[PDB]
Amino acid sequence: LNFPTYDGKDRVVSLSEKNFKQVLKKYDLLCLYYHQFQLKEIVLELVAQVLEHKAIGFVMVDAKKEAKLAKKLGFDEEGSLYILKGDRTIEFDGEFAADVLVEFLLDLIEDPVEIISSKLEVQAFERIEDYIKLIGFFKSEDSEYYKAFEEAAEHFQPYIKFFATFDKGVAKKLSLKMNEVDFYEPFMDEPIAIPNKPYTEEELVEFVKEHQRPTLRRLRPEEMFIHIVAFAEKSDPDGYEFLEILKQVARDNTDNPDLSILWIDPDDFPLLVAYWEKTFKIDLFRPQIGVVNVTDADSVWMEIPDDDDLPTAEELEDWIEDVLSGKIN
Amino acid sequence: LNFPTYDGKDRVVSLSEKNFKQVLKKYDLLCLYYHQFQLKEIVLELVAQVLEHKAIGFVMVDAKKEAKLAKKLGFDEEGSLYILKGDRTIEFDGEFAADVLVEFLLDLIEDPVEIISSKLEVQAFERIEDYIKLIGFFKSEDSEYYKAFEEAAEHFQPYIKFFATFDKGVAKKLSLKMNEVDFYEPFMDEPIAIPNKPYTEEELVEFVKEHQRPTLRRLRPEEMFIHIVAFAEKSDPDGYEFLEILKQVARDNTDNPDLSILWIDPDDFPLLVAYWEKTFKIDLFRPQIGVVNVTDADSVWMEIPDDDDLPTAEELEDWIEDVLSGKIN
Ligand SMILES: [Yb+3]
Ligand SMILES: [Yb+3]
Ligand SMILES: [Yb+3]
Ligand SMILES: [Yb+3]
Ligand SMILES: [Yb+3]
Ligand SMILES: [Yb+3]
Ligand SMILES: [Yb+3]
Ligand SMILES: [Yb+3]
Ligand SMILES: [Yb+3]
Ligand SMILES: [Yb+3]
Ligand SMILES: [Yb+3]
Ligand SMILES: [Yb+3]
Ligand SMILES: [Yb+3]
Ligand SMILES: [Yb+3]
Ligand SMILES: [Yb+3]
Ligand SMILES: [Yb+3]
């Protein structure tokens, strides 16, 4: 009824060789913890208890003990959690926290392509604009073109959402031809149709890798970890009004390749944003936009001293042009 | 740049008497931990570290030692976190986690009334529909009627959001008369004006307490802890399409006082929803609506076996009527 508390049962098994290959196909997902870390230890144990009846295995591979198995799987960062799914290895870079860890695994455990088979599902599909989407129309699951799409979906999972329909009327409502795939940028209404349908998986993966930095995109707790960062609480009238300004500059510079704004809602990352306040020495719980140096963590911020008078889209774009050209950093 | 890690410094002080009243006025907020709990110990220490330069004090009150101070403040649940703000006592009932705890305190630390002073902020105010809102128009902060609204806002903090404007043009755009207060239900566009303005604080608090159970409302990680609960991932076309049906049933029974739907997005509560799957024996990460018994934790769920054919609002409403009238429990 209330919140789960860890019961003491040790579910994080230690994985040796020979024991390895049996457990990779017993489960959908394997969580491998590569080796004072009682905080990271106890989070992994509580997630394993809540998911003890999901098809997810929780193991730990010691750096010194199973150094054989860590070299066999390519474990670089010690103290990091790696997710194995079939032939693929996913390094978790999010916050090592029970909320964030559960959501990542449950995103990863499902099929990488969500199938839309109803016309009423198309309206809800079209209104969801916060992430990159792809959608295709195929004859059936057995098709080589769906398989290529399915294989491409697996390569980007769970960071980019893939969709398919097998219905002529649904595809008619999406204005999709047979074996065609539409690409949706975040916060833009009109999709991009990938040229020269039908597509192989190498054609799809190469298209998505070119289009991986859209003009505006929303940070997620899954996908994370020079850099233009915008801060706006959508739940706050101030941050929402600033977010609406950011959307207008995103739709005015779809031509501009040197513009990629990362919007961070502080309500989605309350611990991370508060910590960055200590690093960036600015109030990030009100509308802000800045550029951050990846190395030195230096930053310069647009002057928004007065949130009852936020910049217009022309003033944001002019500030952006001064930042891209070279104002300070 | 990356995530904060706890540095070893012990900031959770132990608070005695006489030392008490100095630290209550030294700080804006007092976080009191009432007494194997190394998990709760380490979460509180990281939050105190991240917030070490905020006007927030972190203390712990042992049940047996400072039982004097625990009796003086009224601490019932051991292992619970209580937030003190001036004359007010707030028991934290949410997940004992750094993300949820940080967001709660930063919600509590700000002024309970957010002032809107720009007409462009009014459009953004109107699009934020996920929580109860109140907004009033007063002459200035010095007015006795603003003081009553501010005192009412402090009384519901941080669970219900209060707003005020002091500007004639903003109020005209809000269609607010002077000292008038509008009441906003979640997911309903038209506010309710509280009758017989101007209002005392008792007049406002009593109005809000009658109207605290609206037809549809979204759970928050702050405010939480017979009951119709709906499960819908807004980020998923299935869950979004289901969310759109609930809004339609919400607008059809604004008359019905015995209808109060709690929408829980599984993406907002990944640990709690996965845990409830084990208690309710249902896949809650797809569209669901059920009624839960508060005592026995029994539940009965509307049958949604086929997510390509979700119920319409009439079918939801008919299911609701069988549940309110008496179908099963
Ligand atoms: Yb690496
Ligand atoms: Yb890493
Ligand atoms: Yb999902
Ligand atoms: Yb499947
Ligand atoms: Yb299948
Ligand atoms: Yb594959
Ligand atoms: Yb098309
Ligand atoms: Yb604000
Ligand atoms: Yb969210
Ligand atoms: Yb101002
Ligand atoms: Yb301006
Ligand atoms: Yb209590
Ligand atoms: Yb409690
Ligand atoms: Yb806030
Ligand atoms: Yb007060
Ligand atoms: Yb139906």
Which CATH number characterizes residue A142's domain?
3.40.30.10
Nearest neighbour of A274 by CB, restricted to B102, B125, B130? B102
User: CA of B297: how far to CAs of A174, B34, B260, B288, B290, in Å?
Assistant: 43, 28, 18, 17, 12
Closest CA relative to residue A153, chosen from A217, A204, A93, A196: A204
Nearest neighbour of A128 by CB, restricted to B103, B127, B240? B240
Query: Does any CB of chain B come closer than 8 Å to the CB of residue A226?
Result: no
Same domain, B92 and B176: no
User: Chain B residue closest to A167 (CA)?
Assistant: B308
Give the separation between CA A313 and CA A245, rounded to whole angstroms.
6
Half-sphere exposure of residue B323, counting CA atoms within 13 Å on the CB side?
25
Contact present, A81 and A32 (Cβ < 8 Å) = yes
Q: Which two tokens stand for residue A294?
A: 């990846």
Query: Of the candidates B167, B199, B214, which is a domain's last residue?
Result: B214
Q: Which two tokens stand for residue B161?
A: 């959001």
Q: Going by C-beta distance under 8 Å and a sequence separation of 6 or more, which residues neighbour residue A248?
A: A313
Q: Going by C-beta distance under 8 Å and a sequence separation of 6 or more, which residues neighbour residue A319?
A: A289, A302, A311
Amino acid at A86: G
Same domain, A220 and A323: yes
Nearest neighbour of B99 by CB, restricted to A120, A240, A271? A271
Experimental technique for the deposited model: X-ray
Nearest listed ligand to the Cα of residue A306:
10
User: CA of A20: how far to CAs of A11, A68, A78, A81, B254, in Å?
Assistant: 16, 11, 19, 17, 58
For residue A289, count other CB atoms closer than 10 A to its CB.
Answer: 24
Residues B36, B40, B42: CA angle, nearest 5 degrees = 100
Closest CA relative to residue B285, chosen from B303, B270, B300, B304: B270
Residues A160, A161, A163: CA angle, nearest 5 degrees = 145
Contact present, B190 and B196 (Cβ < 8 Å) = no
Q: Going by C-beta distance under 8 Å and a sequence separation of 6 or more, which residues neighbour residue B286?
A: B231, B233, B238, B239, B304, B307
Query: Of the candidates A84, A112, A140, which is a domain's last residue?
Result: A112
Same domain, A240 and A273: yes
Alpha helix stretches (DSSP H) within A110-234: 120-127, 144-156, 168-173, 201-210
Same domain, A249 and A205: no
Q: For residue A184, what is the enclosing H or E element?
A: strand A181-184
Q: Which residues surround ligand 4, an ion (CB under 5 A)?
A: A 111
Residues A193, A194, A198: CA angle, nearest 5 degrees = 115
Query: Does any CB of chain B come closer than 8 Å to the CB of residue A2?
Result: yes
For residue A228, count other CB atoms closer than 10 A to its CB.
Answer: 18
Q: Concatenate the DSSP letters of all residues of B8-76 into one string.
A: S----EEP-SSHHHHHHHH-SEEEEEE--THHHHHHHHHHHHHTTTSSEEEEEE-SSTTHHHHHHHT--
Alpha helix stretches (DSSP H) within B253-299: 270-280
Same domain, B172 and B271: no
β-strand partners of A30: A57, A84
Phi first, then psi: what are they for B167, rounded to 5°?
-115, 135
Cβ separation A102–B1 shorter than 8 A: no
Closest CA relative to residue A28, chosen from A66, A83, A72, A75: A83
Contact present, A178 and A143 (Cβ < 8 Å) = no
3-state helix, strand, coil in chain A (%, to 5): 35, 20, 45
Contact present, A302 and A311 (Cβ < 8 Å) = yes
Residues A146, A148, A154: CA angle, nearest 5 degrees = 100
Same domain, B202 and B219: no
Query: Does any CB of chain B come closer than 8 Å to the CB of residue A37?
Result: no
Same domain, B179 and B152: yes
Strand order in the sheet with B299-301: B216-218, B261-264, B227-231, B288-292, B299-301
A241 to chain B, closest Cα gap in Å: 5
Contact present, A288 and A236 (Cβ < 8 Å) = no
Same domain, A174 and A255: no
Contact present, A157 and A108 (Cβ < 8 Å) = yes
Cβ separation A238–B121 shorter than 8 A: yes
Same domain, A117 and A201: yes
Give the separation between CA A77 and CA A83, rounded to whole angstroms.
13
Give the separation between CA B87 and CA B85, rounded to whole angstroms.
6
Convert B274-300 to b/e letters by CB count within 10 Å (16 or more is b). bbbbeebeeebbbbbbbbbeeeeeebe
Q: Which two tokens stand for residue B141?
A: 């902060």
Q: How far is the CA of B137 from the centre of ligand 14 (A)?
A: 22
* Residue B203 domain boundaries: 113-214
Cβ separation A271–B131 shorter than 8 A: no
Nearest neighbour of B271 by CB, restricted to A1, A99, A241? A99
Amino acid at B246: L
Q: Concatenate the DSSP letters of all residues of B172-241 into one string.
A: HHHT--TT-EEEE-TT-SS-EEPSSSS--HHHHHHHHHHTSS-SEEE--TTT---EEEEE--TTSHHHHH
Give the separation between CA B158 and CA B301, rounded to whole angstroms.
32
Give the separation between CA B93 and CA B219, rounded to whole angstroms.
13
Contact present, A77 and A130 (Cβ < 8 Å) = no
First-to-last C-alpha distance (Å) of chain B:
51
SS3 A174: coil
Give the separation between CA B169 and CA B121, rounded to whole angstroms.
12
Cis peptide before B186 (omega within 30 of 0): no
Give the separation between CA A138 and CA A140, rounded to whole angstroms.
6
Amino acid at B319: W
Same domain, A29 and A93: yes
Give the strand pairing for A56-61 and A13-14.
Answer: parallel
Owner of token pair 């611990």: A271
Q: Which two tokens stand for residue A324?
A: 């891209």
In chain A, residues with a C-beta closer than 8 Å to the C-beta of B279 are: 1
Same domain, B280 and B327: yes
Cis peptide before A158 (omega within 30 of 0): yes
Domain count, chain A: 3
B230 to chain A, closest Cα gap in Å: 16
Query: Of the candidates B60, B83, B112, which is a domain's last residue?
Result: B112
Same domain, A249 and A321: yes
